[PDB]
Copies of this chain bind each other. A is one copy, B any other.
Amino acid sequence: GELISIIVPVYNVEKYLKRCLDSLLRQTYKNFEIILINDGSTDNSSIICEEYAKIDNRIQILHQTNAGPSAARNAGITYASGKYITFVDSDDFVEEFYLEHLYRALVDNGSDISVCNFNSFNEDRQSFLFSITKEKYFCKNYTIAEWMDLNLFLTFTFSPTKLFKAELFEGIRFPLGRLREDDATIYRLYLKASQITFINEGSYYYSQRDDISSMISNAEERIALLASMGYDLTEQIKSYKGRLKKCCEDALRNGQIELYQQCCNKLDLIENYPKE
C-alpha cells in the first residue's frame, strides 16, 4: 500500500517510549515511516530513539531544541513524505492491526479521513478499560455536517486515532507554544474533507496516569469559523457554555483574575441576558 507517515513527538517519555515503538513496528500494514521528533528530551528518550532507528530503517529521528508539542508535530508534518499522515503519542500504544484498519476504512470508502476510537490503559493499576466493546462495533461514512454534530475529546481535541490524506495539511499547522493545540487544529482538517469514515473500535490505547485561556479562545474561534461556513452551531454552543462555566471557576482558583472576569461576564450575558 501507499506510504503512511506516523508522527510521534517525543519529550521525556523514557518509561513509555519502547512500548509505543514496539507496538508500531509490529504493524500489519508495513509501508510506513515513523517520524520521531525528539523535542530536546533530558531523560533517556533521545538514546532510546537512536537505538530503535539503528534496527529499523522506517524510523527517522529528528532532534530539535525544545519548542513544545505543537512545534514538534509541525516539524513532523514538514518532514512527512507519505500520502497519509497520522499521529501517535509516545505515551500510548496500539493493536497490531491499528494502521491497516484505518487505511482500509479510508481507501475502501473513498473518504479523505478515517477515525477510530480508543480504549484506556490505567498505568497505576496496570489494567485495561475496554470501554469500546466488539458488540458495540460499527463503521459509518459521514458528511462533514453529520460529522460536526457528534466523544468530544475523541473527535476534536485528540490528534491520534485518525488517518488523514496528506493534502489536507496545506495551510494547517498546530499553534505554537500553546496547549490544547489539538483542540485548535484537528477540526480544521475535517473542514477540508468531503467524507469521513468512523470505525468504532478501541484499537488505540490511551495511557491514563492546563490552558484555560486556550480552552475558551479555541471554542470561540471554532464557532466563528463554523458560523461563517454555514454549519450548525447547536452543539458547539452547548460545549462553549460548559467551558465558560469551568473557566469562570478554575481561573479564579488559579489567580487568573482577568480571565475570570471575562468568562464570568460572558456566562452572565449568556444565562441572564439572552435575546428577548
Contact = CB atoms under 8 A, between A and B. Distances in A.
Interface in A29-88: 40-42, 44, 46-47, 50, 63-66, 78-79
A143 B275 CA distance: 10
Contacts of A173: 258, 261
A64 B273 CA distance: 26
A233 B237 contact: no
Interface string A233-276: 10001001100000000001111011011101110111001111
Interface residues of A, number: 61
- Residue among A41, A145, A240, A252 with the highest chain B CB neighbour number at 10 A: A252
A245 to B, nearest CB: 12
Given A255-B42, A260-B63, A275 B230 contact: yes
B220 A224 contact: yes
A179 interface: no
Contacts of A140: none
A40 to B, nearest CB: 4
Contacts of A40: 255, 257
B176 A230 contact: no
A217 to B, nearest CB: 6
A63 B257 contact: yes
A102 interface: no
Contact of A253 (B42, B64, B144): B42
A173 B264 CA distance: 12
B194 A276 contact: yes
A123 interface: no
Nearest to A265: B171
A259 B270 CA distance: 29
Contacts of A188: 265, 269
Given A46-B253, A225-B266, A268-B171, A273 B192 contact: yes
A237 B228 contact: yes
A274 B230 contact: yes
25 contacts: A41-B255, A46-B252, A46-B255, A47-B253, A50-B252, A63-B252, A63-B260, A63-B261, A65-B255, A65-B258, A144-B275, A144-B276, A145-B275, A145-B276, A171-B265, A172-B265, A192-B273, A220-B223, A220-B224, A220-B225, A228-B237, A228-B240, A230-B274, A230-B275, A230-B276
Interface of A: 40-42, 44, 46-47, 50, 63-66, 78-79, 143-145, 170-173, 175-176, 188, 191-192, 194, 217, 219-221, 223-225, 227-231, 233, 237, 240-241, 252-255, 257-258, 260-262, 264-266, 268-270, 273-276
